Amino acid sequence: DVLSGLINRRNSMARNRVSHRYLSDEEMRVMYKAGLMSKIIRLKAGYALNDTLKFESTQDQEIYKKRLSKHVKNATKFMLGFGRGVIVVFKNGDDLSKPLERGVDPKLLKIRVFSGDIAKGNNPDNDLRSERYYKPKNYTIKGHTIHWTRVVDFTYYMPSENELPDYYYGGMSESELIYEQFINDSVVQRASGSIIEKASTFVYKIKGYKQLIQAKKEEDIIKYVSTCEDGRSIYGGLITDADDEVSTLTQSLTDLDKVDNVTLRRIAMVTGLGMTVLIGEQASGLNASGEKERQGFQDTIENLQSDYLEDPLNRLAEIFQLGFIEFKDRVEYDKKAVDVAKVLWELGEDYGAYLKDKDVV
Amino acid sequence: DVLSGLINRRNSMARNRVSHRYLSDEEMRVMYKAGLMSKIIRLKAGYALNDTLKFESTQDQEIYKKRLSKHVKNATKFMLGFGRGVIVVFKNGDDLSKPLERGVDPKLLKIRVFSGDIAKGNNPDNDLRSERYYKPKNYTIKGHTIHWTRVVDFTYYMPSENELPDYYYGGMSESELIYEQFINDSVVQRASGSIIEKASTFVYKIKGYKQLIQAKKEEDIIKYVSTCEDGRSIYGGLITDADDEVSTLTQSLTDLDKVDNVTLRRIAMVTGLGMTVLIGEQASGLNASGEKERQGFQDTIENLQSDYLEDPLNRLAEIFQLGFIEFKDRVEYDKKAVDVAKVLWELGEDYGAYLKDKDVV
Amino acid sequence: DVLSGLINRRNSMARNRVSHRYLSDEEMRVMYKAGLMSKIIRLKAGYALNDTLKFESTQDQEIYKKRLSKHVKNATKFMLGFGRGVIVVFKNGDDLSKPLERGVDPKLLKIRVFSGDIAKGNNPDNDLRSERYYKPKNYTIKGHTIHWTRVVDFTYYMPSENELPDYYYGGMSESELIYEQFINDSVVQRASGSIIEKASTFVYKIKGYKQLIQAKKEEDIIKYVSTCEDGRSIYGGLITDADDEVSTLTQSLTDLDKVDNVTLRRIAMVTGLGMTVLIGEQASGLNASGEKERQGFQDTIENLQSDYLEDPLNRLAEIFQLGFIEFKDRVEYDKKAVDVAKVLWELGEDYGAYLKDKDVV
To answer: How far apart are CA C301 and CA C46, in angstroms?
Structure first.
């Protein structure tokens, strides 16, 4: 697809090579505040944790729930916001070093949650012995420092190892995924507001106003126009001159909808949320109940649920002696099938063996 | 995507970096009054608290309801309005210090609710001992001061800790989330009203009116035009001159609908309410009953219900000796399934065990 | 279709011959970070591994799942990202040479996962004896080296052997498949954001500004325009001169939607994901549950499942003494048929033989 001219050079192929921005931590902070991604972070985090946690420990049901299931949500928000959510646990005595797990701390401990801004990862062992180049070995949360096994890390989508330090050992803010986007949409929107005030400008092309400004005795003509504009309406006709010329100029974003369309399409892609939510027509098919509507993007959340939330939640599960915690997605839909399972045999009367391996309860 | 020219510099990538406004408290006050967000704050607050509160204490059913469930609503409104809703409780004796919970105050106490305007957060312990950099330790509500454990804080979406003081230790007004928006829409709307009065201006390009103004004996021509305009209609034809020229100029916001569309789309996003409500077609799918219509955005409210309302309500729950309070979302829809549960067994006649673990009552 | 002119030469046939870019490893790294393909890699990898793994070893059910089924996902992501996903296994003692499989390592071993960036393939035996020109015999993961039978390779779509070294013995990043695409879309998008800010430029064609710049005493006219622009609105009419001329120029991407359409169509093709997901209308028919929605592109994933994931997973299956692992795709849909199978015979009462060879459980 390249020959016989200089087409070879000026096409989009060679005219530009690929490169990716590394948005700074301070810029990462700002987008966490900005309204658009604020819902992005809130939506995706909630869609991951809102009553979606399969607990295999019925006894002391969801002691996770009343204590730190709310800490994790702020922390897993800090995942998406900054690429590094952090949960810090330590006993009543502040310690730089590891938690004494010889007798695993029986709820004699406190809980902290930290954004990737103030948190960070420091020390990787370059050898293959204990934890590979990925996992840090000790890093500072503040002026203080916290041991590796002390701390639980909510790490998002990680890049290749050759550049993992540039994200300081963990995750990638959604901003870094859509920094192309949020800037563009903001540009779309800031321009959107200011176009209307300049949508059409009345113009008094007035002969001699060359001179009046030039003689700086232009005070009166401004006054007359100001009085004239103070009343220019459907009801009173202008009075101007043959040599005068009143005209009207319009300027407006001719393709505001197209660009706002393109920018929003991508954000739906990269974030994984539907197009409908960005437009705001949440009523249609993107909802809470998982019958068919949460199914609209549950795959993305499930992709989130089994990639960056399973690692630390399982690690958090063991540190509190809780069981292995997973996710698995009303039942009235299934009940009609349940009766079908019952009516399978009726061997006189015998238990439908398939009743148990469904939503019997 | 960058090479071979100066394209590298002028694109939306590098031509502008990201930054977020910090709207002042006084501006935060004004938007609480403004009509648009007034419904935003009212809608979202009501959608969170209107008969959505699961009470595990059937005995003295909803003593919360008749006493302060209305205080919270004004307070949780103050959450969204200013980023800081406050409930203040103290006994009959005004105290700066903590409430005597040695014997927890048995309803011998008064209730107050405060906006984030007059309220504020003051004193964080920078150490990790008791309450992390987030939670204040003592702050002033007015000229007075109130102890930390005295006061219940309705804190909205919080930013990163590095900048938490700039919001004075808690939450973020929806305005701060949509200050880009409310200004833009107001700009759309203020311009919308004034465009019609100038939608078309009749113009008397009149030869010699150069001179008549210049000789300041222009009184008569204005009088004739005023009499002429006093009757310019379909019924009487103008009389002007060959050298005269009557023309008409139109100016109008060519893309008023597009920009008003873009601005409203985002507000539906960030607030979480549907697009339909902002347009005002509330009849379609955004309603009160949670069968399918409140499901249109119940996820956002549920995201609100389990993020910023659970913390203080649970704290408020214990201070009044009430049980742990949560939320859980008519039954005639479920009843047909209920009968299906009954007809599962009919082992002679035996209780449907699945009857209890549904809406039996 | 060629005669009687010079048409023979200038048509798309001979005017350009075919050639394919070889995007470098560093460019391969960048796209892994970029937002667009970040979802591509995440989506396709998740759609392949999310609860789609048929385990023939019910005993110790899915010991794969809690230990390294998450290692593989990061590794199979590294397949798509770089064309080479790597899983490295070795005992507590670092070894260059082969793992001692005389007694196959009974879970006394560690697990590593590596991107094709830092990993690479080195040594092919050109003879046909053991492993053909495809399979390497020993390659370096870092400064270190790892034996062939030590390491498990997640190799994507491979090119012809004559050029296999140029990809260093394994796979092809999706980037290499859509480098034509990601560059083009990025070009579409970067231009999309910057067009609005220049969608319409107000122009003061002003007589004499020739001279004012030329006399470099042009300070005042800029000041007046700056004050004039500071207020140019619907409400105040411009005042300019007969010799002056105010005009407005619009520039906008006339076919932004068309090109953005074409680019997105191809990415849906090559990646295999639907068009709906790239647009972001994931709610329609591309979902998680495989009833009908995951069927939208499950063939592509199944094509992925039985091409590049079966090889190493089976190799990984044997190295851990796990059984042969495959894939096979709710049941309430099938249950109505199950009852049909039961009601086939009712020979008095006899077992429906077809019950077993379906989803009985």
So the answer is: 10
Phi, psi of B90 (to 5 degrees): -160, 160
Number of neighbours of residue C358 by Cβ within 10 angstroms = 14
Structural determination approach: cryo-EM
- For the purposes of burial, counting CB atoms within 10 Å of the CB of C182, is it exposed (0-12), middle (13-18) or buried (19 or more)? buried
Spatial contact of B90 and B150, defined as CB atoms under 8 Å apart: yes
Selection from C151, C139, C157, C148 nearest residue C309 by Cα: C157
Candidates C159, C85, C70; CA nearest to C121 is C85
DSSP string, A133-180: SSSBSEE-SSSS-EETTTEEEEE-S---GGGGGGGTSS---HHHHHHH
Query: Which chain C residues are within 8 Å of A229, Cβ to Cβ?
Result: 235-237
- Cβ-based contacts under 8 A for chains A and C: 327
3-state class of B55 per DSSP? Answer: strand
Beta strands A245-250 and C325-327, pairing class: unpaired
8 Å CB contact of A33 and B159: yes
Q: Are B6 and A16 in contact (CB under 8 A)?
A: no
Provide the 3-class DSSP secondary structure of residue B87.
strand
By Cβ distance, the residue of A221, A254, A286 closest to C239 is A221
The amino acid at residue C48 is A
- Provide the 10 A C-beta neighbour count for residue C336: 11
Amino acid at C136: P
Query: Hey, what are A270's tokens?
Result: 């990269």
Do the chains contact at C242 and A184, CB–CB below 8 Å? Answer: no
Is the distance from CB of A136 to CB of A148 less than 8 angstroms? Answer: yes
Report whether A161 contacts C85 (CB < 8 A): no
Which of C187, C194, C234 is nearest residue B1 as measured by Cβ atoms?
C187
DSSP assignment of B197-244: HTSEEEEEEETTHHHHHHTT-THHHHHHHHHHHTT-SSSS-----SS-
Reported structure resolution in angstroms: 3.6
DSSP state at residue B96:
S
Decide: helix, strand or coil at residue C23. Answer: coil
Q: What's the first-to-final CA gap in chain A, in angstroms?
A: 63
Query: How many Å lie between the alpha carbon of A20 and the closest alpha carbon of chain C?
Result: 6
Q: Using CA atoms, how far apart are residues C352 and C354, in angstroms rounded to an integer?
A: 5
Helix H segments across chain C? 7-10, 25-33, 35-49, 63-67, 69-82, 174-197, 209-214, 219-229, 256-271, 275-279, 298-305, 310-319, 331-342
Token duo for residue B252: 């109008």
* CB-CB contact of C101 with C176 (8 Å): no
- Judge contact between A110 and A90, C-beta under 8 A: yes
User: Contact at 8 Å (CB) between A266 and C189?
Assistant: yes
Written as six digits, the tokens of C303 are 């094509």
Q: Residue C239: which H helix or E strand, with range?
A: strand C238-241
Q: Residue A270: which of A181, A189, A187 has the closest Cα? A: A181
Give Cβ neighbours of residue A19 (< 8 Å, ≥ 6 apart): B1, B2, C30
Nearest C-alpha in B relative to A81: B160
Single-letter amino acid code for the residue at B209? Y
Decide: A304 and A44 in contact? Cβ < 8 Å.
yes
| Gap between the Cα atoms of C345 and B312, Å rounded | 63
Dihedral sign, CA of C269, C272, C275, C278?
A: negative
Nearest CA in chain C to B252: C234
Identify all chain C residues contacting B251, using CB atoms and an 8 Å cutoff: 234
**Residue holding tokens 């709310």?**
A70
Neighbour order of strands in the sheet with A151-155: A109-114, A84-91, A151-155
The Cα A310–Cα B74 span in angstroms is 39
